[model samples]
Each structure stands twice: as structure tokens, then as C-alpha cells.
Target: QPEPDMITIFIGTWNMGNAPPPKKITSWFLSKGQGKTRDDSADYIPHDIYVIGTQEDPLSEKEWLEILKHSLQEITSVTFKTVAIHTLWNIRIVVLAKPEHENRISHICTDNVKTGIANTLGNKGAVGVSFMFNGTSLGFVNSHLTSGSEKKLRRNQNYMNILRFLALGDKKLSPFNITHRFTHLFWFGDLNYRVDLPTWEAETIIQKIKQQQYADLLSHDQLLTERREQKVFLHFEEEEITFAPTYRFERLTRDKYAYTKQKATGMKYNLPSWCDRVLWKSYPLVHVVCQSYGSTSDIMTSDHSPVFATFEAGVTSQFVSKNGPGTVDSQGQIEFLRCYATLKTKSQTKFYLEFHSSCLESFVKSQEGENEEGSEGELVVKFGETLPKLKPIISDPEYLLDQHILISIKSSDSDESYGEGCIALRLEATETQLPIYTPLTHHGELTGHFQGEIKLQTSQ
Candidate 1:
């Protein structure tokens, strides 16, 4: 069994500017400092999970995935499986995990939130993926916030837009807020926040970067400035940046920043910024230790250099209580699936459905204590005609992944059987939390439709 231990994760984000991926990106995956002197003693450890996000990608998502898989296979010894892949226009986020821990990972889902013009376009937005690893919920968000030196507020609004709209899994099972559901949340991408410095000062700072002086440049960072004001990235933490700015690099060039005429005029008003970045937030009982944070300037296909961060994220075997909002109780325990449903017959007759478990019996209250709120003991409930709803019922904690659930449709007037159908619940019950429509068939003919949402709860 996989013990509750710290798992290493690697996260990378880059804005390709519609440029195709290079043939070999091994340097990016390797921990070599670009434009900075190499620290040969700095070792590279293969991570348990790899999350790579890109904006303005010219290649298809399939192509990108294949490239990533091939490159990782060639470079690392550990075999990996794709956990989740989400693409929104030019923005994409891909998650891969080691195959050995496949049985321990669950509740994998992806979502996208558009923050472009009128909040309908995909030109600028975020893509997210949420999953459970050894009882710890981890969320990864890759976003391309608005661009412009003066539009710092717009970038902050983009951050809010992503937080408000990015619903990874079933919203009904979990909270609508993406960050709230996870024990550890990571947000990374080309945020487009600029340096809050005058042209002369910015130029002077660029020269200072050559001399390895970053404190002055970092003090003027817009993202940090906004975070200080609580305008964006609230409660988020980022490791100290030891590398130079990751934005506005000349294509196919070495040791040069994009600060020439086209560079100066195009970005003359907007100085180079650390647009590509990685930030994370963690809850109590779970901790994230950032191991490394650096950029890969060797790959010069795009104006934005690729940035990556390595972390040792904590995991637990105990069922962290989710009875309330993000409540963490570090005890080994059972969890319940509370379902509120409404079903109707095709003939418009007054009827209700009976829920039966295939493997384990549905329990009402814990044998050790009193019944919690919204606990109804009966396995079978009644639904009246015209908007009559089914009461909340909890599923057994011992239910297995392959177990099938049977819903029986019957008439209210008598014991007339209408139909019955089977629905298998995945180990991660939240995967099916979306209101699903399951058709009921009695004698090989459709009789009624069952629609409802399933929510996960703790049995404490």
C-alpha cells in the first residue's frame, strides 16, 4: 500500500506565442539554469507528477501530449500515465503521474474558464485539473491573464474570473469554488503582470540582472505588488525567484532579452516582466515544500521563457474530514455519499424511486454515535407528482468502485413495478456528481428517467 508521504511534483508554464514546440525540450525538463551560471552540484530528481501548461500553442494538444510522453520516457526511468489533459484555445494543461500509484489516484477531472473579450472568448483564460492523490485533493490551474503594463487591475480581474468560473469536477458534489475543494492548489502560467518601473529604471534593472542583482527588479514585480494589496493571488505563496525575467526574449537567440526597436517599440512602453510564474496554496495538515524554482532560457522558440518549479507535497492515508468546508480531521474514517434526486415517469403518473445497493447496505447513522443532520434511515423514499423531490440519502462507506446501484421505479397507487436499471458508481463518487439522466427499462423498453446529483460527505 502507498503510505501517506511527501510526493515530488514538477510544474512548468510557458507562453509559446503561437510557436511550435522545439524538437528537443530536454533542457527545459532538466534543471539547468538558463542565462545564469550552472550549479553542477544541484541534483535533479524525477517527480511523481508532472504538470505542464502552455499558452498560444501552435501545435494540437495530441501532438503536444505525444511529444511530452516521448520526451519524458526518453529522459526518466519511471513510467507515467496521463492523468488529465485540458485545452482551451491556445492554452493547455497536461498532467501526468507515475504508473505505480495509479490505484491510489482518483477523482480526476478537468475544466476551463474563459476570460477573454466579454468573458466568452478563449483567447485569454485558464484551464484546470483536479484529482485526489492518496486522500489529498490537488488542483492545478494554468491561466493566461490579460496583457499590458497599466492593466494590472485587468489581470487581477482575470484571476478572480478563473477562481469564480473554473469548476473542475461536479459542482454539485463539491463547492463551486475550485481552490476551496483542494488541500493543495497550484496556479501557474503567463499572467502578463509587468514590472512597475519607469523606462529608465527598467533599463537599469535589466543591466543589473546581468550582474545577478534581482532584489531591485523583483521589488517592482506587479504580481507581488497586487498580492501585497490583496488584489490577486490571495494567500498564495511563491518561492524566491533566483533567475531573470522570463518574458520578452528574442527568438532563437542566446543571452539576449527582447529589448530592441521592434522589441523596444513593441514592448518599449511595457518592460520585460516575469510573466511566466508558478504559485501555490496549501491547507492545514497538508504542506508544500518548494524544492526548486527556475526558468529555461535555452529554448528560445517563443518570446516567453519556460519556468518550472519542483515541490515535495504532503499526502495522507487518513480520511481528511470534509463534513464542513475544507475541514481537515486526520483520523482514519468513513465518508458518505449524500444524494438528492427527483425522478418522473414518462406517463406523467405520480411515482417514486427505490434505491438499492448491490454490495453493501446503505446506512442511516453511525453505530458509534447519533445521526447527523439530513440523515434519513429508509433506503426507499417517496417522490410526489409535479415537483415532488426525493429526500437526502447517504450511501454506505464500504461501497466498492465496481459496485452497481439499482434504482427501482414503481407506481404510487399500487405495488406496480415500472422498471429498473443499474448504474455503476466509480470509486470516486464525485466523478458522477453532475445531475445524470439514467433511463429505466422494465422489459427491454424505456419506462422512466431518473435525474439527480450526488454529493460526498463525511460520516463523523
Candidate 2:
């Protein structure tokens, strides 16, 4: 269960620059600030939800998504599960929220934009996820933008392109539209923005930010200048930065700046800037707070480091009723296993169903079908007739992942089941959601036999 009116969210982004994932990967998601700091007394609690955007993995996105899925499940004690976790080539995003609070989130959507080849391949682009929390909506865009000192225009173009086509809802309406779509939005990534300063001079002054006079150099940061001119992400705000720049680090040395690589690349290498970042936007009436924001220095894997932020916000409450959705089965209350029942049709078509005991309510509206099939088969109607569709509630886990529903079928046209010889006995619910009245299965036949005037699902 979530707090009555608010939810805490931990959103993180990492542009591994295609680095390999670590062996103990789940340790990364145990808590919002898990690997960022080593303070044993920092004691932390879990957030209601988590959204992590990652880019450029050595393995396929599908492989990474599963790797993290199992890890998070172990860390969360199954309290939380992957509501949506996927990736495409270089860009990927994963969202996990509590299963108990599943219905609290809806309209879950995603979109991607490629700016790699002719601005259409995934090697460079953005991946996003958006959804409604209660009635308030939020959107997250995890992007890898154009890089280079002179690539500012191209980066802004990438931003505009994603905003136009990288949507989170129905295509008919632009996703996260200002006038309607999103109530709040978050954009994060290796944005690849840089310092507009002369290369040697920018490199000379990069780490001196800790000194009073050198700190003023950030005024020349390209992203700040663009925002000041209202170019891209016009109104988004970022937490006041206190950490050093996050890109252009030594690949192996890790601590030292990439001065060697900078020198080798000549004009292509730009002085390190806070190219990786997290920013926010919100409509009125929504209160947002940033509890913490910083990069994970300990996660040394690539030239780029990871960044994360934690926040609390007003959101819509859960919607699905407490009774929950679908038919949950039980045996003791005459629903499944221990409390079983049987069904048989006049044409000998037979099957069984296991449903929540609530379905019976101590009174089976009708207990009998008097039609005695002489030759032709027919369906009978007494109280509550047969419903058209079948929705499965999870059944026995050890023996059946999908409960084998046996439906006692009736047909007036044929003496047997669909495409079968004479009146066959039962229709079994195959795992394929297909039929098994043929008595055959992917594994084998529906072997064994039953002979009885078994109640025809006697209980409605």
C-alpha cells in the first residue's frame, strides 16, 4: 500500500557509453542512495517506485533488462515487480512499482527517437516512459543527445525532434503537451552539452571550480546559456549542482580527467561539462520536492558516471477496488484443488472451472440441466447463462501455471466437439489458451478417462 496522498519516486540515469554491466548488479538498486555514499549510518528506506534509464550496454537491452529484473526482485523481497522494463539497441528504460499499488499507475506509455543515421537509428537517441499517478500525470525522457562543442544547434534539434515524435500517449495528440498531457515531466541523460569556452582554457579551468574565482566559469556552460535564451527545455529546472562534471573521465584511471584523450582528439575534444544531468518541469497545483541529487562516483564503469534524484509529489491514489481484478481461485471454499467440483454435458462434452468462492455465494442459481441428448447436442439455459469469454486468475503454481479449465460444452449442430468425431467429453484449457477437446496436447494427450453424470458446472 502507498501513502494516502503522496508517492516517493527514485529516478536514475546512466550512460554507460556501452560498458559492460557489473557482476553484482542488483546492489545498484537496493536503495536510492545505495552506492552513492558509504556512510553506514545513512539508514535509508525504500521508495514507492523506481525508474532507471540506461544507455549503450555491451549486451542487448533485453539481456540487461532481465539481469536487473531478477536483481531488483531479490532486493525488494517480491514486494515490487517490473511493471514495464524494456530496451531497444543502445537506449533502454525500466520502471518498477509495487504490485499491490499496480492500479495506482495507468496510461503507462513509451516512445523512442533515433538521431544516429539520418536521425533515424537507435545508436543515438532517446527512450521515454510516461504514466498517470492517481489523476496527476508525469513523463520521463532518457536521452543521449548530439555531442561536440559546436553541436549545440544539433542537440537542440534533437530535443525538438523527440518532443515532436518521441511521445508517451496516443499519437493523435502530442505527448506531454503543455496545455494538457503532462502535469509534470523529467528529462535526464548524457545530454552531451559542453562549455562554450576555448578548449585549452576550458580544460585549464575545469577542476578549479572548487576555488572562488574559478567557480564563475559555469556561467559559460552551454546548457545554461541555451535555457537562458529559451532554446530547449525552456522552463525545466535542475537542482543546484554541487558535484563535479560527470563526463570525459579517464577510462581506466577513472579519477583523472580525460586530458590524454582530450589532447589526442584535437578540436573534437571539448572541456568536460556537466553534460549528464537531471531536470524537471511541472504544471501548477502540483508540488514537487527534490530530496537529493548527485552522481554515483563509486559506479566506475565508463567515461560517463551515473546520476540519480529522489522526489516526493502529489499523485492520484489507487483506482482498482480492493477486491482486485480477475477471478481469484481457492479450493477450500469450493473454488479449486481441495474444494473441487465437476461438470458434464448431455452430449458428453465436459470440462471444469475453478473460480473464487464468491462466485457461488452459498447458492447455485440453478443445479440441473434436464436436456437428455438423444443424438444431437444442445446447450441448455436455466439461471445465469454461459459467459462468452474466460478470464484466468492464477491457479496452482506447482502443477499448473495456467489452470486447466475444463468446460462442459454443448452444441446443437454436431454430436461431438468442434472438429471432433462424435460427442466428445470435455474441453480443456490449454496453456496456449487454445482448446484441447481434441484430447491431444503439445506435451502429450489429455490421457485417462472419466465416466460420470458429473454436475454440469451445477453451480452458477
Candidate 3:
């Protein structure tokens, strides 16, 4: 089957230490086998591209690679093309590929000069690779930005250098290559900035890139809408739970004994925060689905939960192509026009009927109060008789035309506000429009009666 429209990419971060024998990790990998038995299948299957971090030594590196290969062999269904770029034993970039697309994988790092500028601060490191599917080209860069004592200013500078490198095509001095062309550019790793901060240097860089028309894969419109509606907090929680907490400490305690014992425990989980992130440039032909897997693994692996995203690569007809128009067959025309016409008619009918019904009902209802005074002279007309007598005159189709004409004249003599309803009708006659964004500001001082219990907690 030709599956050209979508491609899936999975990303994960693990902090495998140098001391533990590779066998411990290997056992873990073996446990996550194919979906044959419930316990055999790993929570995450091999993704098209996997970005792993925190590889601290050469031996561990080799062991990790072996485990990865063994795990893939056990599955026997999906094959992977893997790349590991080591950076001073702390950070590593791991890219995985399916067997079918192994030939298209290419791993390369920036020259020492560019790397020197990018990694001027001791803590910053990045690894980049390029891949192709069919004729589509994409470049992926996985990075771990500076943390802790490294001054914020220095981290900001390093981030800017990264941006400049990405913006400038590759040269002896450039991080990017002018001659090389890619359909998509993905940058994903632990950015370490909370959303509530005044202005995250990393997020600032992201905003700047977006201004350049690079679509942020993580900022999909639909996903953003969902987040906004839910009012979800975008930072780490501060409670203890199973949620991933990437950083932790070891402690020793006594349990009603003459001896003390050391134990490892997760710092906290409720303070759920997303320090890890994945961002990508827009590739209109691609569709991506992202999932955040809650932490369920042991501490030997990092406390951070791994986020996975699948990408499907294929051309969609919904978007206008850069090239000339493609063929629109009869079936396509019928489907498109049928939908367009049905939508247009529904919108028009909704607008007119709502306005007409509401307006007439309001006017007639207001007359009910005035008619109360004529009760003494009223000729006790029954509802059925009155309705039948009025049906011939008011129920005529032409009555709406007359009412509309009268409303139009009345609107002309009124103020702009009074005429707004008619103006709205005229606008709808031409085209449909809806507000997607709204701005609101308030300023006033008013007193209102209120009674309620107020509780305050003060730390002692």
C-alpha cells in the first residue's frame, strides 16, 4: 500500500546511569516486547524517530545501543535505523528509523566552530540529523539547554546562537547549509522553561521563528484551542504522585531501629511540569498526533514522562498548492460543491429565521399589556377562532416581504445603533464572518452588596 500522507515520530528521554551494568537496562528493554502477552509489550513501540537523552559514558552508550537493537529484534514487526551522537558523556541524540526507510537516514553534527559558539556555555549541547522519505526531506535537531547556575543571560545567548544557526544556511561558519533543502525542520528536547515566566528565552526564540512562518508542530491550532478551554496549567505540579519528576535526590532514614537505611524516593509529582518539548516547522502534507504518557516506569529511567507524537505524511487536497491546480475529478467537484451549497443555505436560513421570529414575537408580546385595558369591551374571542381569522392575512408568504420593507424604512429614520440589525442582515447577504479572537478590558469602581464566608490560611 502507498501510504504517502502521514508519518509518525515518537520521542523519549531517559537518564540511564554509567554505574549500573547494561544488563539491568537490557532486562527492562526485554520486558517491553511485542503486544503478544500483556506484560511483554512495551508501553511505547518503536517510533519512526526516537530522540533519547542523558547517556553519560561510552560503555553505557554501547550497552544502550545493544539493548535498543535487542528490543527491536524481539518485536520483529517494526525495524529501526538508530543514530547516537555523544556529547561529553552527558547528552546523546538517538534517532530511530524503520527498516524500510533505513537507507534514507543520515546523521551529521555541526562543525566545531558552530558547536563552539552554540556550546560556549559548558551545559549546552545539541545533535542534528537529516532524513528523507520518498522525495520529502526533513532535518531533526535534539538539544538540552543550559540549566541551574548558568546565568539566564548566558542561556539566552546560547539559544540565540542556535536560532541564528538554524536561520542561516550551512557554511564553514554556519550551522545551516544553504544548499541543503528540507521539507520540514524539527527541534525537540528539554527546553526547561515554565510557561508562566515573564518571557522564556526559549519561548521568545520560538515566537520569533513562528513569525518567520515556521509552523510549530506542538502548537497545533486544535490543540491550542483545547488547552485554552481547559485552563490547564502548563508547569510542574508540586505534590507527590506518580507523575514524572525528572529531578530527584537520595536520602537516608531510620525506621525504629538502631540502624539507618538509605532509600530513593521521587521528589514530587503533583507539581506536574513539562520541561521537555518538541517543536517543528510546518509541512502542510503532514499530520501529527501527540500523546503524553504518564510516568509508570522505575526511577532508573528518568522521572520525566515521555511524550510521543506520530506523524503521517501525505498530500492533502484541502490546502491550495504552491504549484498550479491539480485535477479535480467529477467526484471531487460533486463532494465539494454539495458541501459548500448545503452550508451556504443553512447559514442564510438560520440568520433570517432567527431574526424574523425573535423580532415579531417581541413586538406582538409587548402589545399584550396594552390590550389588557380592553377587557371590559372585549368580545371574548376563542384562541382557535382568532387564529383562523388572522391566518389568511398574517400567514401569507408575502407578509414577510411587507414586514421587511417596513423595517427597512424605519431603520433609515433611526440612529446608527437602531439600524445595526438591518446592516447585519446586509452584511450576511454578501458573506459569512465569525469572530475568532476578542479583546476585553475593564475599568470601573462600583459597590455591590455581598455576603460570604472568607477563609485565609497563614503559614506559621
Top-scoring candidate (lDDT): 1
For residues 234-318, what per-residue lDDT tens digits would candidate 3 score against the true structure?
1111111122223221212111111111242122111122445455543222344333322223333333433333343332111
Using TM-score, rank the candidates from best to worst: 1, 2, 3
Worst 10 residues of 3 by lDDT: 333-342
Model 1 TM-score, all chains together: 0.67
- Candidate 1 Cα deviation (angstroms), residue 124: 0.3
lDDT of 1 by residue, 142-181 (tens): 9998877878888887888788778874353221255444
| Model 3, global lDDT | 0.32
The whole-model lDDT of each prediction reads 0.66, 0.55, 0.32
Stretches > 4 Å off in candidate 3: 1-3, 15-46, 55-61, 76-79, 83-89, 104-120, 149-153, 166-181, 194-244, 249-273, 291-296, 299-310, 313-460
Of 1 and 2, which scores higher on TM-score? 1
Model 1 lDDT-worst window of ten: 363-372
Winner of 2 and 3 under lDDT: 2
Distance (Å) between predicted and true CA of 81, model 3? 3.3
